[PDB]
Structure formats: structure tokens, C-alpha cells
Amino acid sequence: NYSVASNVMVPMRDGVRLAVDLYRPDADGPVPVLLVRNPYDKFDVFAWSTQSTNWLEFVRDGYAVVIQDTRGLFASEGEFVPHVDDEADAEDTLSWILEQAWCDGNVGMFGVSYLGVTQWQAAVSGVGGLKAIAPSMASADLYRAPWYGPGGALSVEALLGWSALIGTGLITSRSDARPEDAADFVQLAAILNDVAGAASVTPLAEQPLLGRLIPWVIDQVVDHPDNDESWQSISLFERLGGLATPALITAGWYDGFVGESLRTFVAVKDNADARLVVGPWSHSNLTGRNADRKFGIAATYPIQEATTMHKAFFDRHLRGETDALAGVPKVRLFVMGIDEWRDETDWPLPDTAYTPFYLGGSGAANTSTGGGTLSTSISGTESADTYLYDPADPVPSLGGTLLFHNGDNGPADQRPIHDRDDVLCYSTEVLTDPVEVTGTVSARLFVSSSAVDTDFTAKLVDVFPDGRAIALCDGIVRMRYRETLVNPTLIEAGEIYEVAIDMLATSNVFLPGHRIMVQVSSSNFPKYDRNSNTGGVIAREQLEEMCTAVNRIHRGPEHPSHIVLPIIKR
């Protein structure tokens, strides 16, 4: 049995008060506590909990749960600005909980996406009583996920989609509607029904509606394309290696945060009890069912297993139950292709063979009917594939880690863009034996451009016997950021550069009958904004002033362009 107290007001160091709801067990004395920090209305528990845990079980088992409205939203006072106040507000909140009669000195946190980022923000506060966190679909580096990426391109659908959704909340939570609320609301829905369209306006930086409702969209995100001091101020990642806080980390192969979720595991696993679970989910689709790819009912987000695992984890770190995680693996992955859950002892997997697959082929690799090949042997002939990238006609995004623009079809069939001249395709022969690829994925390409800046993209694909060409993971490099996200420099036209493309991670067995394929291009819109091929401030350029670029991929013995696949052989 328990009770719930609403809109308990908690004062922050600046005297601003945040609203919390208290779910407290009817018990004898103080209890362990779990805190959730939420910008989507603490009252609206059903909206996010289905992506997390049946956490009332925690309350029934003797934990208190605290759900808080972040600063400036719903019942909390103050002004809302994403991320910038969450370290301090979490630290004051934890301090308050620890002071309460009902808290026994042990606090934990759980939750998904922004409700996971907020846990990293809490963890760096140095509050002893924070004993464990469970960040799901989260990031500790907001540039790298979700707003830009390791390659230096703006995740424009992520930004505009999320901004529209936050805006909708404001209007909808309005105390005394405003005359313009009705039409702002209409207008926000129009963005959400056509995020690609919204992201197509030029200059991108001119956002009359979103810029008004949430100035941060432009002032912070669009106006700071380099990973500069403004981003560094809210990044947690460099502080994670110094922590010793157990973390139960969840990710999804098609989730926008996956690269950064996985990296947090690698950063904390040496110094405390870290756990990892990765399913084949995208941000808006945790069902395991997609338009052209079904993973099986066991791939559905296993909410009761997750609840059980969370309880065990918190029992060990907040209640001191030393053998509570008995029999629980360190790592649990949904391995695609065989479509099975599998235990592992570590991430990256021990015994991963980082294997180059070289680009080759007779004739031109343009289109899926071109001659491009992939091989574990270096190509014997120096050759090159060339295409025109025109910002007015980018390659459309299809699956992958899209968040708001058609974000429910991660393992999308790629055949609709296969006929494009600016999509270079390289495939293995049909496989006679299974090949497992589980780990981080990257490419190293030798490239040149007619332009002083451009982008290069790479996407790993499983080609099925029936023709479906299913997306796995992908990445981009914006060439001015080829060597650093902080201090970009331009390139010289015609010169060949060796660049890396961070393609995040996957786990897939390519079965006999399948092929491994890679697509190479210079755009992936609106997952990433389009490069203008000018060397200029891309978000401030008009479409008319952009340039087309003749881009080229070099391959052969002296330019051994390849993808690096994390090969598991068991």
C-alpha cells in the first residue's frame, strides 16, 4: 500500500520552487527513494512509463518514487531552457530528498531520453546519497546526441520535431489561453506532419514560430554548429570516467541516442557496476514490428523483465542486497538476423575482430545495379566513383535513427532510393555462411570534392534474398569537421582526403542467402541538414546561394577505402 501527494514544492538554491509528486509506501520508517526528472508533466505518467518500467511495483515493494516537473514547466516555477539548469536543479533536489523524514539516505534514478539525460546531469553533482542510476535511451554529450552528431551535421528533424513538441506542451498547458494559441497549435501540428518540409526552409535559421516559442532552438542549437564552449558547458561525458556510480543503461539499435548511450556504458563500466541492455527499437516504436521488417514478439520492449531487472539493480545498490543481481548478465543484446536475445560479458564484445571490407568493383558503383563490391581483400585496380550532390535534391532519409520524421521504421527497406545516381552501392557476394557484425561500426574513405566543404555518408544494409535491403546503421562526416568538431577547417578542391565516418553500432547476423551492402553518398535528409557545399554558415544560407558538388570516392591499392565491421565468430 502507498500514498501519493501532489505538487509538493521544492526550493532550489535560487529560491525558485520545482513541483514534485511523492509516491510513498505505507511503511514503518524511512525508505530508499527513486527520482525521475521530467519536462513532459509529472502527472502524465502513462506517456513515458510504457517505454520504461512498471514502476508502481517499486512503490509496492517499499521504494518511494519522486516525479518532478523540470524548471519552468507545468507546476514548476521559473523559466524553461533545455539542459542548462538540470545539473544544479538535480543537485538541490537530491539534497532535499535526503533531508526528508521518509528517505533512508539511498537515492536512485530511472527514466528515458530527456528523463535519462537528467540522470547523467544528476550523477556528476557529487551527492553521496545518489547510489545508482538507470538512464534509458540517453546521452551524456548533447552535441553528439541528439542535436548534432559525431560527424558534425545538425540533426535537423530531431531539433524541429522536439521543439514543436515542447512548444505544443506550453500552449496546451497554458493558464488562460492566449488569442494566438489556437493558430500556433495548428502550425506546430503542420511541422510535425511534415518535418522534412519544415527542415527545407532556407535560411534554416529563420524559424518564426519555433524561434518565438523557444528561442534556444536558434540561440543555442542552430547558431552553434561547432562543438564549442556552449556545448561543452552542458556536456557530462568527460566527467563520467571519474565517477563510481552504478548505471543500468538501455539503448535501441534504431534509437537516436544509441551511439551516445553505448559510449556511456564504456565510460563507466570500469569503476562501478554497469549494465547494458540493447533492443532493436527506434524512439517512437518499441513494438519490434516495422513496415518491412518484423523482429518477433520477443523483441517487443519487455517491460516486465525490465521492471524486474531494475528492481534487482536498485535492491543491490540502494538496499545493499549483495546477491540481488545473481544470474543477471552484464550485457544483454537483441541480435538481429537470428533475432534473438543473447547474454554477453562486455560491450564491446570480447574477441571482436575489427575487419576491413574494401570498396571495389568493375565499372561505376553508382546505383544498386552498378558494379560495386565489398571484399576482405584490398582492391587491385585504382578506380573512382563520381556523382553530383545537389542540395536542392538530397538523398531522403529512410529508417535508421530518425526521431520524429518517419521515426517508426528503423529497419527500412532502401530500395526506394537505390536508383539514384548519387547513391553508390557496394555489396558482398551472396553469403554461404553466416557473418555476425556486433559492435561499433565505422568507415574510412578516400574522398575528393569540387567544393571547399561537403558531406560524405555511409550506411550498412542487410540485403535479403527477396530483395529487401534493410538499413542497419549509418553515419555522416561534414568535411570541415573531418579532424575535429571544435576547430573546423576547409578542404581544397580536387585533393584526396582520408576521412572517418562514425556509423554508430549494430548487432546483426547476415544469414546465408543475404549480402552485406554499404551505401555511400553526400546527404541523408532530414536526419541531417544538407551541406551547402560553400564553406559558409550553412544554416544562414539561402538555397539559391548554395552550390552543387562533384564528389568522388577513390578505391584501390593506394586508396583502400573500406568499412570496418566488428566481426564475431563463435
Curated annotation (Swiss-Prot):
The active site is at S113 (acyl-ester intermediate), D255 (charge relay system), H283 (charge relay system). Residues 237-350 are annotated as: 1B. GO terms for cellular component: cytoplasm. Pathway: Alkaloid degradation; cocaine degradation. Is relatively unstable at physiological temperatures since it displays a half-life of 13 minutes in rat plasma at 37 degrees Celsius. It comes from the Bacteria. Changing W162A: Decrease in activity. Residues 351-570 are annotated as: 3. This enzyme hydrolyzes cocaine faster than any other known cocaine esterase. Moreover, in combination with T172R/G173Q mutations, the disulfide-stabilized dimer (CCRQ-CocE) remains more than 90% active for longer than 40 days at 37 degrees Celsius, representing a >4700-fold improvement over wt-CocE. The enhanced stability serves as a better substrate for modification, with polyethylene glycol (PEG) moieties providing the therapeutic with stealth properties. This is Cocaine esterase. It comes from Rhodococcus sp. (strain MB1 Bresler).
